[PDB]
Amino acid sequence: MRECISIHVGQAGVQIGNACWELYCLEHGIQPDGQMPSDKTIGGGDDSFNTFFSETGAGKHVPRAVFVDLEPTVIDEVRTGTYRQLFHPEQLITGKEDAANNYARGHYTIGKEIIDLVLDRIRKLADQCTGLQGFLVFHSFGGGTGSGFTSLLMERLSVDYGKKSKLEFSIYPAPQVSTAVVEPYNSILTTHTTLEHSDCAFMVDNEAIYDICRRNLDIERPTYTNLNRLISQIVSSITASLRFDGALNVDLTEFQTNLVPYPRIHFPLATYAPVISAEKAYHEQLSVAEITNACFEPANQMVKCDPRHGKYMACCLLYRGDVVPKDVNAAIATIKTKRSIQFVDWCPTGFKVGINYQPPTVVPGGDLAKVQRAVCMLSNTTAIAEAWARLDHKFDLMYAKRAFVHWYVGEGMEEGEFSEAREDMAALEKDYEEVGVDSV
Amino acid sequence: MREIVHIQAGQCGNQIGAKFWEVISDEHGIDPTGSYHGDSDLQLERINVYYNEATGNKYVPRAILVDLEPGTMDSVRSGPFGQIFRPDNFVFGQSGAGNNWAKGHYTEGAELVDSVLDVVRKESESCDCLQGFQLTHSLGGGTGSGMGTLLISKIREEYPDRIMNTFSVMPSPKVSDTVVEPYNATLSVHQLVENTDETYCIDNEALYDICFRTLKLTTPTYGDLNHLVSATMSGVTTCLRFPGQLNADLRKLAVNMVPFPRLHFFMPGFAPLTSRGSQQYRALTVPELTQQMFDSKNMMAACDPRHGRYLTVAAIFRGRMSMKEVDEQMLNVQNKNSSYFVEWIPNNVKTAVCDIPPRGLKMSATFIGNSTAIQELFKRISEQFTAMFRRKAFLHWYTGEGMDEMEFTEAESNMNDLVSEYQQYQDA
Amino acid sequence: XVXXX
């Protein structure tokens, strides 16, 4: 019951998907061949981990997921990788020619050739669900597949599943590892198209993750494998409430209730702690009080925004590991005193807290220290609008000269679709401004 | 006027409902399997009020357990007295209500309400003479709040001449961080003003403050909060459960406590205040039970009774004590604090004395006051409500389920009227 | 505010 289907679109989506499902397996004691010695419910189960994993007669625990890409290289590595046995081949769907960092190709030219097959395979997973909760969609803003095809799929999913929840994990572009000059274009297009089809979207700013890897883990020049392993920990925190359950556990949908005041204001800011190396973590244990404080340090934010210059509309704390109510309550009391944290006048100021006693694990050969307790804060701040602004400015500079616009028109798009998408973004920035204003 | 049908809806409802049955079962000498093993025969005189009888003379609670998710009810069924309840009287869905009044009252709950009323009907036919119903639920969630009020409205349709009683847990930011609870509560109040005869306002703000300040619990748990509710529920229904003279049935209670149809929101108090860890070796004196039971610290509603006036009061004393001395101390409060009692309702304080004391205590006192100070509670919720509604915040959760802004405005409007009505008689 | 039977 309350199953959750993950959809990994494009390189970023897939590779992040690898990190996530590897980590999930380590958290639930699932071997790379799908076998799980803990589970005595053979062939079936009602357990908490069954929301992300189905079971077979063989005793094999299979991810409720789909990997889609318009080009086989990345998914091929999955097919031949350490966790090849974990999936069924029909779950790994590849094209031949990618979208060439072109939204139009991902949404139309190439995407249309594969959209039916994907939906057919998504449908086959939905039939395994006694009560599907919704979908999780991992994708990049900048890629042609990650942007174009994702929008197409999300639109199609709204039609085929009505209003079942659709959550995004969106990789926001960063220059340190950008692959295309037109990523601003693709970003604004996918954001506009998906906006009314997404219930809640967690933006991951690569520059932020790049920064954190460099600063807190002393990684000289972070790789995708570096960023993914950190990102996975954060995704794991957010989905922990769905995959585990205890008395102090608060379901993600409860957090979602607090975090979204209006359908369009559905972009929460994530801040995770502790991100610490094994060298620093040795002989130094971080308390509930300590990690909680880190959540309000912008250095630990997942998107590069400044909540100080913005106003808060919600604050959730997703604790995991060795955390007791007593310490949490005292910890927030401190921050209520030692910070100022302004809320908009129309929202209450309480912090919705959840706790999963299941501690954070770490992937072997990983960079992160294995800590006893960790926390992820989900906040709805007006500062997130800064992310739209930086991206909208990059967009504006190129569209002013219609730079690169011809690659899009050639595939079938119109200039109207551009200005339209950009106007929605202008409205969104305006919306994020409106909510911050005081009442009369 | 004999049998009462109990119902408990949602997480909060089933938790306090279960604890309530735990307590009175012990008081009436009924064990988890349902057999009787008690000394006094006072325990079995009015046992038929809350329990049915079966083969082997086993006693089955007249209780219906309702929820939109199986969580709490699976826990109750594996709870202490879990196997006592009629297995068929478990009526649960799977979708959940997501702390949404709309889901509970209009969509997810409407899909389940008919099945519940089938169990209500079956129990009501077993009755030789039905008084009415008592519901236990929170107003802050979705199931108990939304579906609960729906069941009331539907039950009133099949049993309009019966009495509708409720133990309604009012929300407080001191206990829950869910932002939409003020919406749920305001919507529910509107329903309760219209369709209940008696409502015990159990305020989580009070229960927390009591646990933290008086009982000195730095990290109060739901079990701590419920120990208070359980104690209150036992006391408030004592006059119903054992042989007595005053407020011996729900209608008589309503006639004594409710001077006006809408003003039926009672302020419960209790003494001595107790925690599951507290020792309570020293029984209190009758004067002590009295001074405390009227003390704001002991009120379960988090209202200052000195800010309003008592329209009516019911006081229940339990345990072996000087019934003589009870009258003197009761008459003492009235004559000492005569200003806080309305003059246009002579002798508005009535008292009963039951000999059997509550579990673990030798002397206990329970308070039921229809104070006009209860408005402070509704005023609190009203402010939390408007803070959000003026900006139409979080309404999409509700409009998505089919509701409209107008229905909020009307609920807000009606509860503002209630506050003013409580104020009209406070200056009389 | 964290508050379990």
Ligand SMILES: Nc1nc2c(ncn2[C@@H]2O[C@H](COP(=O)(O)OP(=O)(O)OP(=O)(O)O)[C@@H](O)[C@H]2O)c(=O)[nH]1
């Ligand atoms: N964090 C993270 N970001 C990635 C990863 N792979 C690609 N990206 C980001 O994704 C953006 C490019 O989009 P991709 O996902 O690579 O492209 P795609 O989805 O395969 O679409 P096309 O190749 O154009 O058909 C760049 O800005 C990268 O920084 C990854 O493994 N981890």
Ligand SMILES: Nc1nc2c(ncn2[C@@H]2O[C@H](COP(=O)(O)OP(=O)(O)O)[C@@H](O)[C@H]2O)c(=O)[nH]1
């Ligand atoms: N006293 C008490 N209050 C509770 C309990 N459970 C939930 N609540 C309160 O009820 C509100 C949430 O409603 P809940 O019963 O959980 O939702 P429902 O299942 O849809 O009815 C919050 O304001 C909580 O403080 C409980 O066991 N005891």
Ligand SMILES: [Mg+2]
């Ligand atoms: Mg690619």
Ligand SMILES: [Mg+2]
């Ligand atoms: Mg199983």
Ligand SMILES: [Mg+2]
């Ligand atoms: Mg709940």
Ligand SMILES: [Mg+2]
């Ligand atoms: Mg349904």
